[PDB]
Design an enzyme around this catalytic site. Structure first.
Site, PDB file in Angstrom:
ATOM      1  N   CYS B 118       0.796  -1.226   0.000  1.00  0.00           N
ATOM      2  CA  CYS B 118       0.000   0.000   0.000  1.00  0.00           C
ATOM      3  C   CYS B 118       0.826   1.272   0.000  1.00  0.00           C
ATOM      4  CB  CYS B 118      -0.964   0.031   1.193  1.00  0.00           C
ATOM      5  SG  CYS B 118      -2.207   1.369   0.967  1.00  0.00           S
ATOM      6  N   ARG B 121      -0.566   4.576   2.556  1.00  0.00           N
ATOM      7  CA  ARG B 121      -0.531   4.394   4.003  1.00  0.00           C
ATOM      8  C   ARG B 121      -0.335   5.632   4.868  1.00  0.00           C
ATOM      9  NH1 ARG B 121       3.551  -0.404   4.947  1.00  0.00           N
ATOM     10  NH2 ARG B 121       4.083  -0.017   2.749  1.00  0.00           N
ATOM     11  N   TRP B 290      -9.342   5.825  -2.109  1.00  0.00           N
ATOM     12  CA  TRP B 290      -9.448   6.451  -3.419  1.00  0.00           C
ATOM     13  C   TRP B 290      -8.325   5.976  -4.317  1.00  0.00           C
ATOM     14  CZ3 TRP B 290      -9.165   9.634   1.016  1.00  0.00           C
ATOM     15  CH2 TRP B 290      -7.895  10.177   1.301  1.00  0.00           C
ATOM     16  N   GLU B 295      -3.424   3.424 -11.536  1.00  0.00           N
ATOM     17  CA  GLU B 295      -4.227   2.210 -11.439  1.00  0.00           C
ATOM     18  C   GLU B 295      -5.226   2.122 -12.580  1.00  0.00           C
ATOM     19  OE1 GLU B 295      -5.174   0.877  -7.244  1.00  0.00           O
ATOM     20  OE2 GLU B 295      -5.210   3.043  -6.914  1.00  0.00           O
TER      21      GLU B 295
END
Ligand code: HEM
Ligand code: HEM
Ligand SMILES: CN(C)C(=N)NCCC[C@H](N)C(=O)O
Ligand SMILES: CN(C)C(=N)NCCC[C@H](N)C(=O)O
Ligand SMILES: [Zn+2]
EC number: 1.14.13.39
Lengths: 416, 414
Positions: B118, B121, B290, B295
């Site tokens: 992630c 974070r 979000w 991505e």
């Protein structure tokens, strides 16, 4: 299913098992507790200096192993020649503590070391390598001639050819043959008064070393550094490369007429010279090798890295991009045009180069070849994927297993 | 023992001591590194043939409790010693125990914090935890999911949230959301081996039709949810269109881009991972925040096995698709990522570009260095799919390990 690492390609859905890693005899940085696989220099791919000769027993097992790989590559495993050579090796080690390779054995090991290099995406060419035996070399002056011959052959006026030049191996109770420089052709890095650096920040220490060793410096961004060659037990001698021997390429852009005016450029021949070549336990502290560049090494890393030339902002301003906000992707846009300029300049200057698409596509083909051949291929994912457009290349979607196979190119401490 | 970590761009060095707290093992060994693998059958929290050994559950629980009371600084108080007593008593008699709402909230935030793959974070402490452990049917799960969606979306001003359904019990089936994300697009396998829509969702689209869903034939058709209550067949539930905020893609300067009809949903909510807190396992705990622009623009739309629009866009840009050296792919890719950022910004919907995101991650690594002595990160997942070296994380060496609480992968319920 099988007791070996399962590897998947998320683009094609294909699966493969890596059986080759079982052959590794050298440990890596990782443990089941944590992955240290992103470290550039963990203390697992670096061969510290052996001030004392390797324990005769350890050297013998590495020697025996290498010989077996040699005879196996020629399909004579278990033969009289194989058993005699093994006998001849332990005989040498028995009385001298070390041994020597036959000519064809050196050629084999050097090609295997490259083939074994996890960070090289250009391994599809592993079979095509010119091995210049320079194990006879006895002076720093001779090292210069050899290197000059290497650069001449390898450069071949733009139509580059892969080559390596092997100097005498490490001999207990005797100094190493070392090339102080990181590469044969490197640009100087001048530490200014205001702290900044004129040229290439990466080459600051060596530049200061050449200076301290009599080199009379210049004051340009693109000055080619002289060689600092060291023969056994002697201080290093400084040798300046003839300008005609160093082929360079002036960078220009196919459409942006102003790029030429930036006065940027790069040398055509990439030749790593500070790495150690280990073959059957024998160490070759000086053994420069070279091939050709992949466009992203120059256009992205060398030119656009923050701690290198850092030219991204300058090119962005010239392109008139909003450099005040990240969401404009000004860094992405300039980098693209910078990489395109390198490709165009090399293609125009008839010098050899390969872009990151073609490069990775050919590595995938290398991966299939190696799967059939050795049952796998040790690869370092982070180094295989290009510094820009990662997922746009096939290798991104390819899982990879990384391990240390011998022969190999290892890192080594600086001679100073 | 303690790994020396280094930033090549700044020459800075740090020692990771947080990796010593790792109790769960990864796929790597000294012989070979398997860090680039997406899911080794190892870390994966698969099903079991009974109740976990009480010795292990108890120790995983005591550790978590110790962690929680340390978080609120009451480490040692009576409330700490009695909470341990309560857990020991319940595990001994029932072979399991249950968490308090406060502890669950701490756990969920600590799972995210511990997530190696992630990049966002830095937002770890900002999480809306909806307690859904009082759910007994697929129908209830649906109501809870809609509540989560309407909250998270917030008319475009997205907010990070997580709904935690009932934990797993040794005596029964699991609560599961069959879909990989609450919002996804359909992938219909057309006659000629072709695929209309999103190829990564072919199998789940098929399952929905197997369970009676009336499909469409658009490239961007939202899939219905398949929610499963213990030992029951999954049920079909079509999400209310008003709940699903979608963003039409357009380019700031290329007018013809809009005419391509591309679009993408606003809420990225992973619904197939397992949340583990103190030995307890929550097989249904969808979470959202979000998107990071890459991505959608790079992976979802450009990956060869996804929407694969690269060439089409290049053609519209009139680029040289003959040779790889014309860098047409890289060029098309940048404009697609630009169109995405422009679109989500025009529609007043939260998004973050890779440059902004990675910079915040560097800051986060720093906060964590002083806080816990390190930070588990998966370099391959942290570094964006385009312009890797152009971001600061590329030049940062990272250490990867397993900390608990944790989000783990788990088998497909079918
Ligand atoms: C023929 C063309 C070749 C190409 C295009 C190629 C390309 C590359 C690239 C892109 C790297 C990454 C370097 C970086 O990012 O700093 C690399 C690494 C490497 N290559 Fe190749 N390579 C080629 C030839 C060779 C040859 C001839 C040898 C050896 C005989 C070799 C040995 C290696 C080694 C050992 C590394 C790892 C360097 C390190 O650990 O820092 N390569 N190569
Ligand atoms: C605040 C906004 C957030 C952003 C921008 C962000 C971004 C990302 C990105 C880019 C990835 C990699 C995704 C991929 O490559 O498929 C990721 C993975 C992940 N994130 Fe975050 N994240 C955010 C919030 C969250 C939240 C709220 C949670 C959980 C409470 C979370 C848990 C995770 C986990 C467990 C993964 C691993 C997913 C996997 O293994 O497939 N993230 N995140
Ligand atoms: C032929 N070889 C070995 C290479 N293509 N690259 C080696 C490293 C060069 C370095 N990245 C540079 O750009 O100077
Ligand atoms: C809020 N979270 C965790 C995320 N930003 N992403 C999770 C994965 C989404 C997937 N890459 C996708 O493109 O849908
Ligand atoms: Zn590893």
């Amino acid at each position: 299913g099988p007791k070996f690492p399962r590897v998947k390609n998320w683009e094609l859905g294909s699966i493969t098992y890596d059986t080759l890693c079982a052959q590794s005899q050298q440990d890596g940085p990782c443990t089941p507790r944590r992955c240290l696989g992103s470290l550039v220099l963990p203390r697992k791919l670096q061969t510290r200096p052996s001030p004392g000769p390797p324990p005769a027993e350890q050297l013998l097992s590495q020697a025996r192993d290498f010989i077996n790989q040699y005879y196996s590559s020629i399909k004579r495993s278990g033969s009289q020649a194989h058993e005699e050579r093994l006998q001849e090796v332990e005989a040498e080690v028995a009385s001298t503590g070390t041994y020597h390779l036959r000519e064809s054995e050196l050629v084999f090991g050097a090609k295997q070391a490259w083939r074994n290099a996890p960070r090289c995406v250009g391994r599809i060419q592993w079979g095509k390598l010119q091995v210049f035996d320079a194990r006879d070399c006895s002076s720093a002056q001779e090292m210069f001639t050899y290197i000059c011959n290497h650069i001449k052959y390898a450069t071949n006026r733009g139509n580059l050819r892969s080559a390596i030049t092997v100097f005498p191996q490490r001999a207990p109770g005797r100094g190493d043959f070392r090339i102080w420089n990181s590469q044969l052709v490197r640009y100087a890095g001048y530490r200014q008064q205001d702290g900044s650096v004129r040229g290439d920040p990466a080459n600051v220490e060596i530049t200061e070393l050449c200076i301290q060793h009599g080199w009379t410096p210049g004051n340009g961004r693109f000055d080619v550094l002289p060689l600092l060659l060291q023969a056994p037990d002697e201080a290093p001698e400084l040798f300046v490369l003839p300008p005609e021997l160093v082929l360079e390429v002036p960078l220009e852009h196919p459409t942006l007429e102003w790029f030429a005016a930036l006065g940027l450029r790069w040398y055509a021949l990439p030749a790593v010279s500070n790495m150690l070549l280990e073959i059957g336990g024998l160490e070759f502290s000086a053994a420069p090798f070279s091939g050709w560049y992949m466009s992203t090494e120059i256009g992205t890393r060398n030119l656009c890295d923050p701690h290198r030339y850092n030219i991204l902002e300058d090119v962005a301003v010239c392109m008139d991009l909003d450099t005040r906000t990240t969401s404009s992707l000004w860094k992405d846009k300039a980098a693209v045009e910078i990489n395109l300029a390198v490709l165009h300049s090399f293609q125009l200057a008839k010098v050899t180069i390969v872009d990151h698409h073609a490069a990775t596509v050919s590595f995938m083909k290398h991966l299939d070849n190696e799967q059939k051949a050795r049952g796998g291929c040790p690869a370092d994912w982070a180094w295989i994927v290009p510094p820009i457009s990662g997922s746009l290349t096939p290798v991104f979607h390819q899982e990879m297993v990384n391990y240390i196979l011998s022969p190999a190119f290892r890192y080594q401490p600086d001679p100073w």
